[PDB]
């Protein structure tokens, strides 16, 4: 019923409500310019959140995405919640940011916010080559949710950061993925997402960085941010499912053709129009290593500071069996010293980036293990693996050297001769591009990917998840 749906009593804060209503047309102009291409008249079968009530939170129906009901939804407030780590452990959580942390928390929220529209901008062309209505609908669902995450951060900026907050909300729509004068902040969000295989890896791997960053902020002493991220985690889960099941369905299809043709010869697989498993492995290597750089330098005074001040906790902070202060704790990280990769212990507070990275690696591996059930049930030997964490890194201690996927420091000549086996080549990408082509007949799936296990919201897999309204009704006519 509400114009800006929310469970935050927005209408009782009239100054804030005015400011968000003032900002909304510019969000909608951004959505129209940079959102899913040519989609202004589509009716999409979308889920929309209307609460955080884990039973009846999200309801489905057709909507044109310009009319999507983007809302602000915080996890329920908890009475007498305490801060759980850092200097301030045991004190009451903050409803407003302490002045001394204000600009730091602001930059953290803006940086998180910036990735949300960035992903929409990267993915805006994908619809033209959607391999199915089911997949097109999933893409759009991810898009409108990422749009909501921008709302979720812009709300915090306006509600808790005054004028600076408003100015950040405006600049969040002035930056643009890949733009020369005003690029998005983070490299991985500034690059192209050129085809559906990249899109599925991105939502499987890079949205998972979102998951771990958000789980760290879900711990924050700044409780409105903590409550915001806590609810976004439940949405991020859907994104991770799109990416994991997306790739799982490509692997499934490729294995079907391997069994049918009785061969694992790449040339024969490609003649049949599937993506050979070794090439899938390269895309995994590419997105995994690129995403890894997002956690930042292994050793960081800044990250020590976020923890100590109560701004950002460790993943699942409350399950960790230590003092949650870490003045006298250690953490084991790698190091490179000439022609050797070694391990060393450093003060735990200085290595929080690396700890979060390690948590993400573990989570990604759990998903790859699930992928591996597929070749295994076909009786194939192929297994997907993650490359050594030092492989293909632009950030941190491995940035000045080459590491092979199996964890050796290698020479410039070996990198130059071998990396074509490890990362997608121009020729691999051209091949994958040649498979990309829309498939919009109900219940039909492009030949490079298998059908999903089930539909959406109990609908058949052949349901018309998107109705294009190809006819162009005339103004006032």
Q: Which residues bind ligand OH (CB under 6 A)?
A: 146, 149, 207, 210, 236, 239
Candidates 135, 168, 207, 209; binder of Fe ion (CB under 5 A) is 207
Among residues 204 and 422, whose Cβ is nearest to ligand OH?
204
Residue 257 CA from chain centroid, whole number = 31
CA-CA distance, 269 to 250, in Å (whole number)? 13
Say which residues have a Cβ less than 8 Å from residue 441's Cβ, sequence separation at least 6.
Answer: none
Q: Which one of ligand OH, Fe ion, none interacts with residue 114, CB within 5 to 8 A by kind? A: none
**Smallest distance from the beta carbon of 236 to ligand OH, in angstroms?**
4
CA-CA distance, 17 to 216, in Å (whole number)? 28
Among residues 195 and 207, whose Cβ is nearest to ligand OH?
207
Among residues 83 and 156, whose Cβ is nearest to Fe ion?
156
CA-CA distance, 213 to 130, in Å (whole number)? 29
- DSSP string spanning 193-248? --SHHHHHHIIIIIHHHHHHHHHHHTT-SBHHHHHHHHHHHHHHHHHHHHHHHHHH
**Smallest distance from the beta carbon of 203 to Fe ion, in angstroms?**
7
CA-CA distance, 434 to 273, in Å (whole number)? 9
Contacts (CB under 5 A) with Fe ion, residues 231-250: 236, 239
CA-CA distance, 279 to 276, in Å (whole number)? 6
Contacts (CB under 5 A) with Fe ion, residues 62-121: 116
358 binds Fe ion (CB under 5 A): no
Listed ranges 64-72, 189-197, 207-215, 413-421: which one lies at the site for Fe ion (CB under 5 A)? 207-215
Among residues 184 and 389, whose Cβ is nearest to ligand OH?
184
With CB under 5 A as the rule, give the number of residues binding Fe ion. 7
Q: Is beta strand 341-347 parallel, antiparallel or unpaired with respect to 330-336?
A: antiparallel
**Smallest distance from the beta carbon of 9 to Fe ion, in angstroms?**
24
Contacts (CB under 5 A) with Fe ion, residues 132-191: 146, 149
Annotate 98-119 with three-state secondary structure: CCCCHHHHHHHHHHHHHHHHHH
What length does the chain have? 477
Among residues 145 and 219, whose Cβ is nearest to Fe ion?
145
Among residues 210 and 375, whose Cβ is nearest to ligand OH?
210
Cβ neighbours of 208 (radius 10 Å) = 23
**Smallest distance from the beta carbon of 146 to ligand OH, in angstroms?**
6
**Smallest distance from the beta carbon of 459 to ligand OH, in angstroms?**
24
CA-CA distance, 368 to 247, in Å (whole number)? 10
> Which residue ranges make up the site for Fe ion (CB under 5 A)?
116, 146, 149, 207, 210, 236, 239
């Amino acid at each position: 019923s509400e114009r800006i749906p929310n469970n935050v009593n927005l209408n009782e804060n009239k100054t804030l409500q005015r400011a968000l209503e003032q900002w909304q047309p510019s969000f909608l102009n951004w959505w129209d310019d940079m959102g899913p291409e040519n989609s202004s008249n589509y009716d999409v079968y979308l889920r929309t959140a209307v609460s955080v009530d884990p039973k009846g939170w999200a309801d489905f129906g057709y909507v044109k995405m310009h009319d999507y009901r983007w809302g602000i939804f915080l996890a329920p407030q908890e009475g007498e919640k305490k801060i759980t780590f850092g200097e301030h452990k045991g004190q009451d959580v903050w409803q407003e940011v302490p002045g001394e942390y204000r600009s730091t928390l602001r930059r953290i929220i803006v940086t998180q916010g910036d990735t949300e529209p960035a992903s929409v901008e990267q993915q805006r062309h994908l619809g033209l080559t959607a391999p199915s209505l089911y997949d097109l609908r999933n893409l759009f669902q991810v898009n409108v949710e990422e749009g909501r995450h921008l709302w979720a951060m812009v709300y915090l900026l306006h509600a808790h950061f005054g004028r600076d907050g408003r100015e950040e909300g405006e600049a969040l729509l002035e930056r643009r993925s890949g733009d020369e004068d005003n690029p998005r902040i983070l490299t991985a969000f500034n690059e192209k997402t050129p085809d559906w295989l990249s899109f599925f890896m991105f939502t499987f791997i890079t949205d998972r960085d979102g998951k771990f960053q958000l789980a760290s902020l879900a711990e924050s002493a700044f409780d409105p941010l903590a409550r915001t991220c806590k609810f976004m985690l439940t949405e991020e889960a859907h994104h991770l499912f799109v990416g994991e099941s997306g790739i799982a369905r490509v692997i499934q299809r490729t294995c079907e053709v391997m069994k049918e043709l009785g061969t694992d010869d790449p040339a024969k697989l490609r003649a049949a129009g599937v993506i050979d498993l070794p090439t899938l492995q390269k895309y995994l290597n590419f997105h995994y290593s690129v995403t890894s750089d997002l956690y930042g330098a292994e050793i960081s005074s800044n990250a020590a500071t976020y923890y100590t001040n109560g701004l950002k906790g460790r993943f699942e902070e409350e399950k960790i069996g230590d003092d949650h202060k870490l003045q006298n704790s250690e953490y084991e990280v790698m190091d490179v010293a000439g022609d050797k990769i070694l391990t060393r212990h450093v003060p735990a507070l200085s290595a929080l980036n690396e700890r979060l990275r390690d948590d993400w690696i573990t989570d990604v591996q759990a998903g790859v293990d699930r992928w591996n059930r597929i070749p295994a049930k076909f009786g194939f030997d192929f297994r997907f693996t993650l490359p050594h964490k030092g492989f293909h890194r632009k950030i941190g201690m491995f940035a000045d050297v080459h590491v092979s996927p199996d964890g050796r420091l290698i020479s410039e000549a070996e990198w130059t001769h071998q990396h074509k086996n490890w990362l997608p080549t121009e020729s691999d990408r051209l091949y994958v591009h040649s498979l990309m082509g829309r498939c919009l007949e109900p219940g039909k799936f492009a030949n490079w990917i298998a059908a999903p296990a089930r539909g959406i919201n109990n609908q058949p897999v052949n349901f018309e998840y998107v109705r294009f309204n190809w006819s162009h009704p005339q103004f006032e006519k």
